[PDB]
Every structure is written in C-alpha cells, then in structure tokens.
C-alpha cells in the first residue's frame, strides 16, 4: 500500500505456488489486488496477492519461478506498494509467450494441440496481472513446461 | 603399447598432489610469518620504551644522589 | 638421582615452619618471609611431581601477597597456580585465571587478558566439553585484540568463533564472519591467495539456508572477486547446484567423490556435505 | 620424457622435505618468540614499580 | 610431432627451470632462517640475565633503604 | 560486569571527581595523582566503547604532563589519544600523531618517527584520499629510514611513493625510483630474481612518454642485465613494440588478451596497458 | 620546512655555547658541554650535513673519554663512524677501530666482530684493498667461532675462501671449502647445499692439475656418495675426460650445455676460463 518493508518467504503449499499468485497473509490484503514490489531503485515487478491460511503476517511467500525472476533471497528486505491498472491502455487483447520444456526427463515427440491449450490458459489466470518478461510454469496434460513472456499486444 | 600409456597416466597425478601439498604448506608459512612479524614489532616497541626509561631513571637518580 | 621422598619431606617441613611463622603474627616482614617460603615450597612440590600441593601453596602465597598493597605479585602467583592446576582439576585453574584476568584488566593492559581468555577457552573446549563459554571467551579475546589493532589474532579468533557457530547451526554469524574475513584478506599481498577458501566456506552455509540464496551468493562473490571463477571450489559448487536442481543424487555423489579423491575432506566439510545431500 | 618426469618427481620430493623442516623449525621459533614476549612484560612492570618507589622515597 | 613434441619439450624445460629456482629459493630460506634462530637464541640469555639482575637489585635496594 | 551503562557511569563519575580535584588543587604533588586518575578514566572510557571520551582524557593527561617537566609520558599520552581518535576523529588523531612526531624528532629518536609518518600517510590515503600529503609523508619516512641505514623499509617506501607518482602521471619520478630499486636488488643474492619486475615497470613508463624511449630503455636493461632477455616480460614488451610500430591494434589486443589469459594482472598493469592502447589507437 | 639554514644556525649557536662553557673550566660544565654537543650533532644529522655531525660526535666522544666514562665514548665513536660512512671512509674506519679497541677491553666479542665486519665491508665496497678485508673477515670469523657460533662463523669463511681463490691462493680456499663441507654434511638441514661447496673445491683442485682434480673427485665421492649423482659432478667427469685429449670443442660444448639450463656467475666463468687457458694447452 504505502511501501512498507516486509520479507520474502517460501511457498506454503504446492497448489498455491502453481497458482502463479503470490501468497499473502489474510490479515494484510485481499485477493484480487496488485502490488508493484520494489527491490532496487530500478527494479520493480508487478504481482498479484492471494490469501491463504497460515504464513506469519508481514511476509509474502513466493515460488521458485518468482524468486528466480526477481532474484529474491529468503530473509531479504523488500518494499511492496499497491499498483493500480489503467483499463484504457493496460487492457490485454493478446500476448506472446515462448514455451519450452521444463524437465528434460519428460521429452517426447507426441503432437501438441496448440489451440486446445489456449482456452485452458484463459481458464487458468483470467483477470490476473501479467507483465512483460515474467517467467512462469505451465501445466499441460501430464506435462510441465516453462513459459516466458516476450511481447504483449493490446 | 599400453605400458607407456599407463606410465604416462601414472606419472602426472603424483606431481599434482605434491604441488598442492607444497601450496598448502607455503600458505600456512605466510600466515604464521605475518603473525610473527607483528609480534616482533611489539617486541621492539617494548624494548625501546624499557631502554628509554632506564636512561631516564638512572640519570635522575644519579643527579639526585650527587646533589643530595 | 631425583627421588621424590626428600623433596616432599623438605617441602612439607618448609610449609609447616612457614605456617608456624605466619600463625604467630596475631611488623610486616613476617608476611613477606612467609610468602617467600610458600613460593619455595610450591616450587619444591612442583619438582616433586605433585601438582595439587604446588598449586595450593601458590594460591596461599598469592592470597598472602594480595593481603598487602602489592597486587601484581598476586596476579603472577595466581597465573602460576592455574598453570600448576591445569593437570588435576581445571576448575580451580579457571577460577584463578579469571581472577588474574580481572586484576590485569583493572591494571590497564589487555593483551595478556586476551591470552588468558584464549587459555580459558582452550581449557573449556578440551576438558569441559563446552562450546558456548568457549565461544564467548573467543569473542571477548577477539574484541580485545581488535581494540589494539591486532588484526591477525582477532581474525583467527573470529575464524574459530564462526566455525563453532556453524557447528551449532547458527549460519548467519558464520557467514557474516567469513565474508568479513575474506574481504579483509582480499586486500593483502600475502593473505590474498587464501581469500578464496573463506568465501567457499561461507557459500556452503548459504546452501544450508537455501539453494537460490547460494546461487546468488556465488554470483555476488564471483563479481566481487573475478579470480574466484577459476578455483576448484567454484566448479564443485556449480556442479553440486546443477545436480541438486533436478533431484539428481547420483551426479552429486560422483562429483563429491571425484573432488575428494584429489584432496581429503575434513570433518567439517564432510559433515556439511552430508547434511546438504540429506536435504535432497 | 620419462626421465624428465623422474627428475621432476625427485625435485618436488626434495622441496617438500625442505618445506617440512622449515615448518617445524619455525614452530620452535614462534615458541621462543612467545616466551620472550611473556618475559618483557614482567621486566617492564617490575622496573616501573622500582622507579616509582625510588622517586617517591626521595 | 607438431604441437605434440613442441609442447612436451617446452613445458618440460620450463617446469625444470622453475623447479630449480624453487630449490635455490628454499635453500636460501633455510640458511637465513637458521641465522635468525640463533640470533633469537642469543637474545634469550641476556633477557634472563637482565630480569634476574633487576629483580635482585630492586629487592636489595628497597630493603636497605627502608632499614636505614 | 559486562554492563556498559554501569561502566560508563563509573567512568564519568571518576572523571568528574578528577576534574573537581584538579580544580581544587589549582587554587605539583597533586598533579601526579590528577594524571593517574585521568589515565584511569581514559582506560575506563576505552573499555566503555566511548572512544571520544578516552581520547579526550588522554589529551588532557598529555597536556597535564606537558605543563610539567616531562616529555616522554606526554608523547605516550599523545599516541594513545591519536590511536583512540583514529576511529572517530581522523583530524585530531593526525594532530596528535604529528605533535608526537615533533616531540620524538626533538628528542632524537628517528625510527619511531618514521613509523608514525607511515601511519599518518596510511590514514591520509585510506580516509581523506589525499595523494600528495601521503606522498610527502612517505618521502619523509623513506629519507629517515635511509638515514638510519635501513634499506628494506626505505625501499618499500620508495616503491609505494613511486607507484603513487606513476598513478599521478609523473612518470620520471617512478622511472628513476624503479631503476634505483632494480639496481639495489640486482646487487643482492636473494632479491636478484625479483630484480626483473622493477625493470619491466620502468619499461612501461617509458612507453607512456615515447615508444622509441621504450626501445632504448629495453635495450639498456638488456645489455645491463642479460637474464632479463629470457623473461616473458621482455618478449611481451618487444611484441607490443612491434605491434605499435605496425599500427596493427588487433595484434596488440590479441597478445594482451593472451597474456591476461595465462595469468591475471593488477589494476596498475591493466590501466597502464589501456593508456598505451588508447595512445596507439590514436595513431591508427 | 625550516630549511638547512636555520638548523645550521641553531647548531652553530649550540656549538658556540658549548665551547664557551668548556672555556670557563667542573663536572656540570663538561656534562652540559657534551649534552649540547650531542644535540648539535643530532641537529646536524637532521640538517643533512654529514661532516659537522661526525666532528661533534667525535668531540663528545673525546669529552666522555677524558672523564671516567667508557661506553658513552664508544657509542659516540660508532655514531661518528656511521655519520662518516658517507663523508670520509678513513675517519669512519678510524672511529670504528677505536670503538672496537674500547669494546674488546671488557670482553664484548660480538660487537667487535660486527664492527670488524662493517670495516671489511667498507674496505671491500669502495677501496680496492682485498688483503685487509680478508684479514678483517678472518678476525671476525675467529671472534664468532670463539663463542661457539658455528652458524655465524661460516659466512665469513666462505667469503675469505672466495677472495683467496680470486687471489690465486688455491690451497687456503680448498682447505676452507673442504672444512665447511665436512661441517655441513653432518647437519641434515644444510646437507642439501653441501654439494655446492664440494663442487667448488673440485674446481679449485682442477685449477692446479687434472690428476689432482680426479683424485679429489674420487675422494669426495667415496666420502660423500650423493655428490656422485649430481649434475655438477657429471660436468666435472665430462670435462676431465674431454680435456685429456686436447679437444677444446668438447670442453666448450659441455660448458655451453651446462650454462643453458642454469646460468653461471662471474666467479664460475672466470675459473672455467682460467682452467681452459691454463691446462687445455
């Protein structure tokens, strides 16, 4: 909200981490809000807040992809401030994502129905904030892949 | 044939081991030498102070007894 | 011939006659002669291989001398008593060493106080199988030495403190001390070559706390110290990170064995490596 | 080439022995240094006490 | 041959020369360090003499002056 | 106990008692006790982590000794105050050190003055980053050490001051100092082997003024010292000179990169090589 | 800061004060005069003057000498010699000799030996008199040996042997080298270096005749076996075999081959040249 200092923490559960939404204490904020985490004077990344039981108030839990993208270490100080979206311009009409294998063990030559998965993406994180250069995990049928945002079209 | 190959493969690791041992010994040597040098510097300071005080005290007592 | 019968007989006779002399004093020459005879009897008993009696005589002489205005003689006698008592019972040695430290610190000098603190910490570690009091004594000695700009001894004491803290799972203090010592040694013409080793140790601590933290610490260290990018420790830690990132234990073991083949691992390193392996 | 490796092996062994001897003798050196450091403090303290006593008596 | 023999010969020769230099360095180290050791041994006896002399002198003079 | 509040209160009360006692006496015998109590207060302040109070007490004790016919004790108090103030007040520590240096140089002793001059130069370089005053103090310390027949300390001071001067674009001073130290090591059995290094540095300095001067200096060093020929430094210098002659910056860059690959270089070497690189790049 | 002018003025003022005080001559006056002389000498040393300071130190030494004080005079004389180290070698030598004479009266051998070593350094570094340097080094070696300081009594012997070999007195050099090698071989620490001494001795024997070198090499090998498996002994054997048939080509080829791996100093090349020019003919 006002930029108060808090601490990065580990994800409480695998399901919440796979949701791609940063877990925050229920006492601080409500699900659906957006905060622009400020790490350095020239490093600010947008994130969405989801409320889950447990987790001590005053700390935000991040999954491995988020810590890798923003380069946060456990116990490091971090500044969090609320972010407001401009619907007139920030509305996303289309996005460009690069998809690659997440684990080399599960490589296969089976055909991949690209269109079939597209709707699922909409079904997963609709109304959720997305920023250019955000690295995330993607769960296809019995498949784990890595997704990287490269371009965004209105 | 394979005799010379095995000989060449067996005459290289030992040099590495000996060189690494020498490296460790030399490093420890350097650290302890630095410590000893600091100790000797303190030694010299103490000796200088002691000798200066000896000169001062002997001169003072000699003049005092001379004048009575 | 160095039979202890005559030495013991002479020592006990001297002790008894000095006790008689001091007892009669219900002007101060009696105390001085009693202390002299006490010191001689203590030395004779030390020659007789009996350390308890020598220490008791030393302590009695120290107390008698401290009864007078002179005090540094009492400190000398107390440190001698502690040295004598280091064999049979360490508790009395610790008590008298603490008293001598107190007197010396009151006098004004601190280097001898630091040395006595180091001796007390060594006694604690060797005999009383205690680490916390040893840690406190090492910290006090390091602070005293650093107060006099004695960098080498303070650095060694801090190294021992960081090692013991790491043994006790207190990673933050260990990493802080290791980073400080590595940075200090980076700017020396002689110690520079060792600056790598300390960093590696600190890096290992990070692995206990987390993985990405260790990776970021490695990146920071390499950027700060580019020459760290060619040392074997960096390559080993990179390989271990690669193996540990995909739930690979086989490659972890092969890399560990390959590195250990060239150089034998110590108890600290092998224990930390076993902990890291057990993590996953 | 094999004779070369033999020569290097012999030379490194000799160097290691020399280093070992230097380490031990220097340990003895450090012990002596510590002893003299211990003695000088008592030297100074006794001298200071004697000087103060002599000055006060006069 | 080509890189093979040239590398063999050059590296072997350079290593031999460097090792000989290290041997000479260590010999000189040992000589000078032995000299330092005997120098400190010389210090020790005079240190002991001085401490004994000063202790006896201060004790005797204090007793003599106090009694008078 | 280890409680800091109690020690601080005790030290402050003791200092106040000493101050009132000295004020009462001011209304020779009691000045000695005043000095002793001031020294005790300074020690307590030092062990109380209040460095400023300990330094002030040491300075007051030094002044009280100065007003009395005593100098060595005053200088000892001066150095104690300076060391205490090193952490908090660099300027007061520098003043105490320079006054004590004047005191020693008045008594006659020189080596301690050289050590304190080196300490002053070190504080100046590490805190106030003033190159000129550090250079002057190093020169004074080197002169004092040479006057006392001490060569190793003088050689080290000369090396440091020459390096600082080279960092300040004064190439002739560094060149002459390096040549002198190189000759000195040349006439020794132990340092002989290191004697090459100094010469190499000199060569680089010559390349900064002209490349022809660099060739002339290299040839002079070669004829004076044949062993410098086989050293890799001479080959590198000759190859760099040839590349500069042919204006082929690519060959110079490749050779320097290979030399860095075989072994690392300090900041001095890389900065001088970069200066030479830009000088040659201007030619092409 | 104050420049040499002010320091010189102050030193001259102090000297005039001391001269006037001694003129009206009693213990207090002479003590003040000597103290003022010491202060003036210290100021002169500060002023960078190296002649007036030595004269003032000598005057203070003489004043102490006339009074019943000896070690103070010795200290003043050694200070004067140190000051004269850059002013006039002869005055420094005389002052150091007087200091040695005073010191040796009370049995302080080490200080006298160090002063003799310094005198020999002066005699050998600037002046071209090698006989006096050899004599002084021998005196210092004897003084050190008298105190069981065998470790510190060997460097002077080696220097003396080297200079004697340079002076064609090969018998003395051979004797000294053999004695040093025999003493060193027993010490495990100094054993590694002992080879060199023996090798040098062999050269000294070769400078006389070939058969003497052969017999000496055989004697050394029998007495000490490791000397037989060293490169220097290999070179010695090769040279002895080659020279017998008057083949300078083999001699020079072997010399160059030895020089290639390790360089030789001036002494070794000079001895090799002498041997080749003398016996190869």
GROMACS .gro file of C-alpha atoms in nm, chain A residues 64-65 67-69 71-74 135, chain C residues 175 202-223 228 234 237-242 244-245:
model
   43
   64UNK     CA    1   1.079  -2.068  -0.720
   65UNK     CA    2   0.998  -1.905  -1.058
   67UNK     CA    3   1.226  -1.565  -0.678
   68UNK     CA    4   1.436  -1.657  -0.982
   69UNK     CA    5   1.274  -1.385  -1.194
   71UNK     CA    6   1.617  -1.257  -0.767
   72UNK     CA    7   1.491  -1.250  -0.408
   73UNK     CA    8   1.659  -1.439  -0.124
   74UNK     CA    9   1.492  -1.562   0.194
  135UNK     CA   10   0.873  -1.637  -1.627
  397UNK     CA   11   2.852  -1.625   0.701
  424UNK     CA   12   3.053  -1.902   0.358
  425UNK     CA   13   2.898  -2.029   0.035
  426UNK     CA   14   2.846  -2.370   0.193
  427UNK     CA   15   2.650  -2.209   0.476
  428UNK     CA   16   2.419  -2.049   0.219
  429UNK     CA   17   2.344  -2.393   0.075
  430UNK     CA   18   2.210  -2.494   0.417
  431UNK     CA   19   1.974  -2.195   0.428
  432UNK     CA   20   1.854  -2.229   0.067
  433UNK     CA   21   1.957  -2.303  -0.291
  434UNK     CA   22   1.881  -1.983  -0.483
  435UNK     CA   23   2.042  -1.792  -0.197
  436UNK     CA   24   2.361  -1.992  -0.251
  437UNK     CA   25   2.346  -1.929  -0.627
  438UNK     CA   26   2.304  -1.554  -0.575
  439UNK     CA   27   2.587  -1.552  -0.320
  440UNK     CA   28   2.812  -1.732  -0.569
  441UNK     CA   29   2.728  -1.475  -0.836
  442UNK     CA   30   2.800  -1.189  -0.594
  443UNK     CA   31   3.132  -1.341  -0.487
  444UNK     CA   32   3.244  -1.405  -0.845
  445UNK     CA   33   3.156  -1.049  -0.945
  450UNK     CA   34   3.726  -1.687  -0.781
  456UNK     CA   35   3.352  -2.272  -0.758
  459UNK     CA   36   2.970  -2.584  -0.611
  460UNK     CA   37   2.839  -2.522  -0.964
  461UNK     CA   38   2.828  -2.897  -1.027
  462UNK     CA   39   2.654  -2.958  -0.694
  463UNK     CA   40   2.397  -2.688  -0.774
  464UNK     CA   41   2.334  -2.843  -1.115
  466UNK     CA   42   2.071  -3.062  -0.677
  467UNK     CA   43   1.840  -2.864  -0.909
   0.00000   0.00000   0.00000
